[PDB]
Amino acid sequence: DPGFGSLQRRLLQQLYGTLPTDEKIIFTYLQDCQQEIDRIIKQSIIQKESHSVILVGPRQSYKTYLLDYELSLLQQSYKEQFITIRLNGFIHSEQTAINGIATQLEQQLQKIHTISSGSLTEVFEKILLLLDSITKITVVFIFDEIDTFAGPVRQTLLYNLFDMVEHSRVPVCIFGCTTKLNILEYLEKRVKSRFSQRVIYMPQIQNLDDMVDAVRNLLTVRSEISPWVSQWNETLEKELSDPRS
Amino acid sequence: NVTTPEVAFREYQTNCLASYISADPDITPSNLILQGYSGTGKTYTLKKYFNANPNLHAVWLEPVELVSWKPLLQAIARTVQYKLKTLYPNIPTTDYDPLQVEEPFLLVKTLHNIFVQYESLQEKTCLFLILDGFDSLQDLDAALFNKYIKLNELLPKDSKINIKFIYTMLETSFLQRYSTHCIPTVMFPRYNVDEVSTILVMSRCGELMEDSCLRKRIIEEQITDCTDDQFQNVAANFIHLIVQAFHSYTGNDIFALNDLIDFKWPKYVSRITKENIFEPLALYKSAIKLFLSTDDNLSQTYDLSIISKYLLIASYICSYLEPRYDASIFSRKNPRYLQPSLFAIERLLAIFQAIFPSLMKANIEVFQNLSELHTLKLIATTMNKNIDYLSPKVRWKVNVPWEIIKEISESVHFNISDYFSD
Amino acid sequence: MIRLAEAHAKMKLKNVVELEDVQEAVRLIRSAIKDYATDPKTGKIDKSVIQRKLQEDLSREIMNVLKDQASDSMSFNELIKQINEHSQDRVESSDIQEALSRLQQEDKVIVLGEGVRRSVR
Amino acid sequence: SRFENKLKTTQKHQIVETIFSKVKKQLNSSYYLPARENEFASIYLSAYSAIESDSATTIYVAGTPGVGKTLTVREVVKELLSSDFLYVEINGLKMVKPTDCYETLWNKVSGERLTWAASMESLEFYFKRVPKTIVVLLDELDAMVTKSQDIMYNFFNWTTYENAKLIVIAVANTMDLPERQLGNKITSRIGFTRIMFTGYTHEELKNIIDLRLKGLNDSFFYVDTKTGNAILVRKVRLRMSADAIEIASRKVASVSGDARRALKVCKRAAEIAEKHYMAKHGYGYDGVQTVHITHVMKALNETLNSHVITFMTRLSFTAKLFIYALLNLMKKNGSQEQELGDIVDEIKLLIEVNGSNKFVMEIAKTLFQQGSDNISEQLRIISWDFVLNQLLDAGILFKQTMKNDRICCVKLNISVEEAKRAMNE
Ligand SMILES: Nc1ncnc2c1ncn2[C@@H]1O[C@H](COP(=O)(O)OP(=O)(O)OP(O)(O)=S)[C@@H](O)[C@H]1O
Ligand SMILES: Nc1ncnc2c1ncn2[C@@H]1O[C@H](COP(=O)(O)OP(=O)(O)OP(O)(O)=S)[C@@H](O)[C@H]1O
Ligand SMILES: Nc1ncnc2c1ncn2[C@@H]1O[C@H](COP(=O)(O)OP(=O)(O)OP(O)(O)=S)[C@@H](O)[C@H]1O
């Protein structure tokens, strides 16, 4: 029957979170944090702050998930108010990261309405003079495994970006994702000092009951797609309720 | 909504694979790990799944035919662009140089440039890029698996087309290094013996019932015209026989068996007659002389000469006799198992001149045959291949096992059981 | 074990060896050896995490029982025979005492006189 | 320049500005100074002598970041701007390659794009040929001088020339930099004329704070109670209680005494109070205010406390088991280095030392097979690979690389003591 296929579609696209952004259901045990992030990000876009921050927590901690949740949520609200730039630490070496910035910047400008031209040195100085310098566009960054930049050798790119945080009139924002709990000691004196010293640890599930409630959130559907949705959710809560099931 | 095929021993895996993969790019996860050791038919169950579901779109790569990640990237680029050119002939396109990409980020930029133009698509469609054996890349490092995991994120989220990978790997000692990513994965355990036989027979009857040699010997012997089943019976019987007789030697492989079968089928055919076709028993009792030895080998009385024999047999003497004792047990008045210790030149010459049967002092043929040996890699040097023939720090060690030593001793009639004492 | 358990039973003037009279024999033989598994050198510089988990799972199970046992009151001994005897060897049951003491602090149950043990409303 | 307009858009619906927002806005890290007063004048007169008399010298300055030295030299060369010179911020940590400085130089001299070779050729040419003073900011010199000092060798052998139209204002991190990597011959040309920058006293910190709060200290805004907007509908006032400022200055001057750290922690407490005030009234983002000591107390404590303890108190029971076993091994062998398979053996111990208790039975079952006796008899515990990794990448645990996973070593990066304490909670 069509209904069962439709309901399976709904449940599956939920269990990837691929629902439309307004329908995503974020777990309670971390709401505040994204709330904490929400301000941190929205007042960095609307009120044009320029503060940096580092999310930290183990893998599979929804870091990029919370980030893209916020960005999508803002997209429908403030479409052109900003641009987004993500430079994964893994694939982007310290030198390739420059070209990454350049290219993502140019193809964001071509979406909001010559940069990659030149050599690595030239494109780097170009992005410098471009950023460092009615409203002004804010440019939000996202780093995955930012720690890989923070090798003992250079720690250059982080330094330059935190300098942008410190100086540039364009209100920038940085969301470093990583996993090294003692991320700070990696950052050198110059880098640490540049850094706003604000790092938010991501929470973990502290109570069995919290995980039960998280499963409840995930599995539950909130509208009628197939006639069984009521039957579905009632069977759901039945099986999830009894501590002997 | 997809047609899950059926495989003789992949029921759970077929179901879970069709569950982790569908048309909808939304409910389709980013990556996937078909894991399991070589001999479980991953490259076959996956193919026999795709051929059941042709509406979707995939690309097939052979990471073993490539060598490094550079050709890997370049091949990914060229295959993707050609696959799209051949998937939608109508859309105009500007092909980007697949030989231009040399960095993992160059790949992402190129793919973005390739996908932004396909935005005239009618619906979000998936594209499953299959890497067949991402483990066996000859230059693997810790920092490659994640390098390929993360490409989902860099690429735009709302592109009309969605690249989704399917990695294939073995040696769970590798997949363990990436558990915390919690990427969905399926495992293929190796088969038991019986199911091995089942797969093997149902896959090789088509080869053996209609091969050239058996059909030939049909008319080459009394005709005894018969139905197809008689050949089925005899072939399947030979199959069960060879597998049940060589299992303990081959393990649960499917390829090794697919080699033994072809190495031992022609002779077995030769040993059939007019009568045994209805009698597998006597057929076995007649062809026995092969069922009991691999004969997979295709102690030599080495060409080397007397002076070489003595050179080698003396250079073997300090695989147990350190220079602490030689000047005692050889004067002019167990490490048989372990890897040999290192000689030094002019000790070899010493023991040689000792146990050569004052008779000889010339050393031109001696060193001549020494270089001969070193070209035969019987007494190799731990040091380099060019400066050995100086006298810098350089050690020599035998690379012949003890049986050839017994042989050389008996043939030269010199005895060696003496110098080893414990 | 045998020559020593029969001596223990000789003590207390017991005429026949019981079952709960070889147990202290085992204890005594284990006086020397209690603390090493593959390598010697006992060491053992004497609340553990695995003890935490033991108390926790006991709490889980006993709450589930007492909420499934509608007659909310039962003795500690009755409760032991209800759970600690269903299967393999009995437990200290003073760790059960700590469990129920926690359930008094947390107030998930109420001893309510030594004779029984009730839960909370 | 060209792309600057490309960052300016129009859709802006009267962004709401609350009180603490304005505060942090002037409290920004960008906009005479009290802390460095005699240093200001000293470097001012150094450059005055070097330029107004048309000579060339080397002004070395060193000290930890955040002492204002970048701002201080900028103030000096800014007052000098009003009275020949090219302020060329050659930051080694901004140079993509080490040699790239040359090109900037090689550009700022003529505006040409060639290699570093011809760059320095024409540079020295200009330094010894041109008939007759350009302040090149050698920011964070360390990066440039790492390979074999050839870079700084050049950068100062240029300076040593007499008629060289070349003043350098070098800033390094540490004082002994010229005496630990630079060549002795180089060290001499560097000279003994280096100005040191001390830390900052909490007095100076108060000064800089009230400076940033000059026009805003204890001042009045005109705040509409409906929207939370602030204008420098009730005329509210705000006081920034200088006692919290005092305690923050004291704490920072204690360990570091850095302007950046102090500014930022002040901003942090400010925005904390801001979010509390916003929550208490819910203005969203479209009588009298103060900042209690408790705000700065929280904001400052958060800059010291770690999380490793509060983290390990939240790991999976498997992880805690692993760690506790590792600690038993550390004290049993006194080696603070264990073998991985040995740890597995110890976990087996710890599971079996307790009796056949039904609860130990459940533990054994699950930890070795998630129930479902159908599949059972695991060699090493479930998720063991997974939890090992979840630890390792988290920087807690630290392991060498041998594909043989029974003799590979393992070591705690954190202190044993704090780990034990974490086990005790
Ligand atoms: N495109 C996506 N849409 C929705 N959820 C996603 C997406 N990609 C990943 N996730 C979720 O992200 C969660 C894991 O967090 P991620 O941020 O993706 O990875 P992480 O380990 O938490 O941090 P990273 O990504 O490794 S730096 C999982 O629950 C995934 O379901
Ligand atoms: N269930 C099956 N049904 C039919 N044939 C099978 C089955 N399983 C394995 N085979 C055969 O065994 C072969 C082994 O396939 P492969 O996937 O190459 O083996 P493998 O484990 O992948 O090792 P590789 O090739 O190095 S990845 C297949 O090509 C089939 O011919
Ligand atoms: N006297 C002051 N008045 C106002 N703000 C100050 C003062 N001193 C320092 N600051 C602030 O603190 C920052 C410290 O920057 P600087 O110390 O000049 O840079 P730095 O010492 O060179 O650090 P680097 O660049 O990593 S070596 C300044 O940019 C101001 O934001």
Among A167, A101, A110, A172, residue whose Cα is nearest residue A136: A172
Residue D343 to residues D348, D350, D369, D381: CA-CA distances in angstroms?
9, 10, 19, 11
Q: How many CB atoms lie within 10 A of CB B41?
A: 21
Backbone angles phi, psi at A143, to 5 degrees: -115, 135
Is B237 strand, coil or helix?
helix
Q: Do D348 and C58 touch (CB under 8 A)?
A: no
Ligand 3 mean position, distance from CA D29 (Å) = 8
Among D334, D200, A65, residue whose Cα is nearest residue C45: D334
Q: What b/e string do you get for B90-115 counting C-beta neighbours within 10 Å, with b at 16 or more?
A: eeeeeebebeebebbbbbbbbbbebb
Q: Atom 15, ligand 2: which residue's CA is nearest?
A: B41
User: DSSP letters of D5-58?
Assistant: GGGEE---------HHHHHHHHTSS----SSSSHHHHHHHHHHHHHHHTT---E
State the burial class of residue A88 (Cβ atoms within 10 Å of its Cβ: 0-12, 13-18, 19+). buried
- Cα D28 to Cα D37: distance, rounded to the nearest angstrom: 22
Q: Do B176 and D403 touch (CB under 8 A)?
A: no
Backbone angles phi, psi at B126, to 5 degrees: -95, 165
Is A172 strand, coil or helix?
strand
The yes-or-no reply on D/A contact (3 CB pairs or more, < 8 Å) is: yes
**Ligand (nearest to CA of D205):** 3
Locate the chain A residue with the closest alpha carbon to B27: A13
D61 near D138, Cβ under 8 Å?
no
Indicate the pairing of strand A199-201 with strand A52-56.
Answer: parallel
Contacts of C64 in chain D (CB under 8 A): none
Among B375, B250, B262, B354, residue whose Cα is nearest residue B311: B354
User: DSSP letters of B7-30?
Assistant: -TT-HHHHHHHHHH--S-SSSS-S
- Encoded amino acid at D370, one letter: Q
Return all residues near D78 (Cβ < 8 A) that are at least 6 apart: none
A210 min Cα distance to partner chain C (Å): 16
D229 near D18, Cβ under 8 Å?
yes
Q: Do B177 and D386 touch (CB under 8 A)?
A: no
Range of the domain at B100: 11-187
Locate the chain D residue with the closest alpha carbon to B176: D385
At residue B147's C-alpha, the angle toward residues B143 and B148, to 5°, is: 130
Contacts of A190 in chain D (CB under 8 A): 65, 93, 140, 173
CA–centroid distance for D30 within its chain: 16
Q: What b/e string do you get for B210-241 counting C-beta neighbours within 10 Å, with b at 16 or more?
A: ebeebeeebeeeeeeeeeeeebebbbbebbbb
Indicate the pairing of strand D88-89 with strand D136-138.
Answer: parallel
Question: Which other chains touch chain D, taking contact as 3+ CB pairs less than 8 Å apart?
Answer: A, B, C
User: What does the longest C-alpha to C-alpha distance in chain B come to?
Assistant: 99
- Cα B404 to Cα B401: distance, rounded to the nearest angstrom: 6
Q: Experimental technique used?
A: cryo-EM
Locate the chain B residue with the closest alpha carbon to D402: B173
Quote the DSSP letter at residue C87.
S
The yes-or-no reply on C/B contact (3 CB pairs or more, < 8 Å) is: no
Residue for token pair 């696209």: A13
Q: Atom 26, ligand 1: which residue's CA is nearest?
A: A59
B100 near B80, Cβ under 8 Å?
no
Is B315 strand, coil or helix?
helix
Domain of residue B118, CATH code: 3.40.50.300
Among C79, C55, C77, residue whose Cα is nearest residue C67: C79
Most A CBs within 10 Å, among B30, B154, B183, to test the A interface: B154
